[PDB]
C-alpha cells in the first residue's frame, strides 16, 4: 500500500514548529528560572514537496486517524505517549524476538564477510596441509 492524496487540496509546503531537546543552549537558557517562557521554547523550519513527502504526509495523517481513534477508545490512559516507544519495541521484536535462522527470509544477519574469511582459510591449506606427499 502506497499513499495517494485524495484531498480537495494539498498545500505542498510544510512550515513547522517543534522543540529542540539539544543539550547545548547558550549558557543559562537551559535553567528554567531564567528560561524562555511557554510561548518561545519552539524552533521552526520549512520543508518542500521533494519526493512528494508533504502531499504524502497529509494523506497518511488522514488515513491514520481511524486506526488511531479506535486505539484511543480502547485504552483508559488519559494521555497516551507510549505509542512511539511501543512501535520501536515491536520493530525489534519482529526481527529479534525469536531464534534468528541465518540466511532465512526473516533473519537480519549478513554472513558475507565471514564466509569470505573461511574460503581464504582453505586456499591456505591446499598449498601446505595438502603438501604431505612433497617433502623437504
Amino acid at each position: 500500500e502506497a499513499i495517494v492524496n485524495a484531498q480537495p487540496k494539498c498545500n505542498p509546503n510544510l512550515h513547522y514548529w517543534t522543540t529542540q531537546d539539544e543539550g547545548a543552549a547558550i549558557g543559562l537558557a537551559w535553567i528554567p528560572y531564567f528560561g524562555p517562557a511557554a510561548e518561545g521554547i519552539y524552533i521552526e523550519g520549512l520543508m518542500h514537496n521533494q519526493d512528494g513527502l508533504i502531499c504524502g504526509l497529509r494523506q497518511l495523517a488522514n488515513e491514520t486517524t481511524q486506526a488511531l481513534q479506535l486505539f484511543l477508545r480502547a485504552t483508559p490512559e488519559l494521555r497516551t505517549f507510549s505509542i512511539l516507544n511501543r512501535k520501536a519495541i515491536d520493530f525489534l521484536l519482529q526481527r529479534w524476538g525469536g531464534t534468528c535462522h541465518i540466511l532465512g527470509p526473516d533473519c537480519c544477519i549478513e554472513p558475507h564477510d565471514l564466509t569470505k574469511n573461511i574460503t581464504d582459510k582453505i586456499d591456505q591449506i591446499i598449498h601446505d596441509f595438502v603438501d604431505k606427499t612433497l617433502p623437504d
Binding site: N13, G45, L57, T75, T80, C107
Partner: protein, 262 residues
C-alpha cells in the same frame, strides 16, 4: 496504527507481515509524530463552516495523545460558549493543555448555544490540536486548530527532519458573538468594539474583516450612542475558491437595535 516509511523515493504505509532488513531504525529519534492542520487539505476555515464540523455528544469520554511537531496554522479557534441560562458549556482546560502555539488568526467566539451534550467532538473524526497534545474534545477558552496526526520512520539520511535545521511570528485575535451555537440555525456577529457588531457571512476572509475593522474605525461608523449598533454589508463585494497559500475597499454605509446597511 499505520507507520510511514520512505521506499523508492516515495512515502508509503509500511506493512507488518513482511518488513525487511534494509529498513534501519537506529534510535527512537527516527520516529516522529506530526500534527497536520486541516486547512492544508483545503477545508473551509471560516467560523460558521468550521463550527458546522463540531457537535456535542455524551457518554464518550475524552482522550488525549501527544505529537512532537505541528504545522504553522493560518486559522485557529478559541471557544467560550455558555448555555442560555448562564451555565458553562465547555470544560476547563485540564492541567498541561495549552493553546496551539502557532496561529495567524485566532477566531475568538463568545456566545450561547443549546449545547445538548457533555463534550464537544469533531464530527469528521479529526482532532483538536493544542500544544503538542491532540484531544478528541474542545476545552473552554483554549486556542486550537483542527487536524490529524501521522507517525513515521525517517531514514537516517533524513533523521534530522523536523528535529534540527525565521522572519517571525505574528498573531491577531478576532472577536465574534453567536447565538444558537451548534444547531443548523446559528447567527454570528463580528465585533469591532463593545456595541459595534457586523453581521457575518461565509465568504468574508480575515484580511477583509481587518480592513472592515479599519473602515468602521477610520471612517467613524462606530456607534456614538450607548445602544448596540448592528451594521451589515452590501452583497456587492465578490471573490469568485482560492486556498490561502496560493497568492482594497472603497464603499460607504447608510443608517436605519440599529439594524443599518452598507
Amino acid at each position: 496504527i499505520p507507520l510511514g516509511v520512505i521506499h523508492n523515493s516515495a512515502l508509503q504505509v509500511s506493512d507488518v507481515d513482511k518488513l525487511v532488513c534494509r529498513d534501519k531504525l537506529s534510535s527512537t529519534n527516527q520516529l516522529r509524530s506530526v500534527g497536520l492542520n486541516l486547512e492544508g487539505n483545503g477545508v473551509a476555515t471560516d467560523v460558521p463552516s468550521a463550527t458546522k464540523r463540531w457537535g456535542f455528544r455524551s457518554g464518550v469520554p475524552p482522550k488525549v495523545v501527544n505529537y512532537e511537531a505541528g504545522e504553522w496554522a493560518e486559522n485557529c479557534y478559541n471557544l467560550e460558549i455558555k448555555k442560555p441560562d448562564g451555565s458553562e458549556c465547555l470544560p476547563a482546560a485540564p492541567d498541561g493543555i495549552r493553546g496551539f502555539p502557532r496561529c495567524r488568526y485566532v477566531h475568538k467566539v463568545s456566545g450561547t448555544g443549546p449545547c445538548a451534550g457533555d463534550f464537544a467532538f469533531h464530527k469528521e473524526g479529526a482532532f483538536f490540536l493544542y500544544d503538542r497534545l491532540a484531544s478528541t474534545v474542545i476545552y473552554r477558552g483554549t486556542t486550537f486548530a483542527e487536524g490529524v496526526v501521522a507517525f513515521l520512520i525517517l531514514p537516517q539520511a533524513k533523521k534530522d527532519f523536523f528535529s534540527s535545521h525565521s522572519s517571525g511570528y505574528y498573531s491577531t485575535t478576532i472577536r465574534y458573538q453567536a447565538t444558537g451555537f451548534g444547531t443548523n440555525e446559528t447567527e454570528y456577529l463580528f465585533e469591532v468594539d463593545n456595541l459595534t457588531y457586523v453581521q457575518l457571512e461565509s465568504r468574508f476572509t480575515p484580511q477583509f474583516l481587518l480592513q472592515l475593522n479599519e473602515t468602521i474605525y477610520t471612517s467613524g461608523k462606530r456607534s456614538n450612542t450607548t445602544g448596540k449598533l448592528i451594521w451589515k454589508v452590501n452583497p456587492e463585494i465578490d471573490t469568485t475558491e482560492w486556498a490561502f497559500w496560493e497568492t482594497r475597499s472603497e464603499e460607504l454605509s447608510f443608517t436605519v437595535x440599529x439594524x443599518x446597511x452598507x
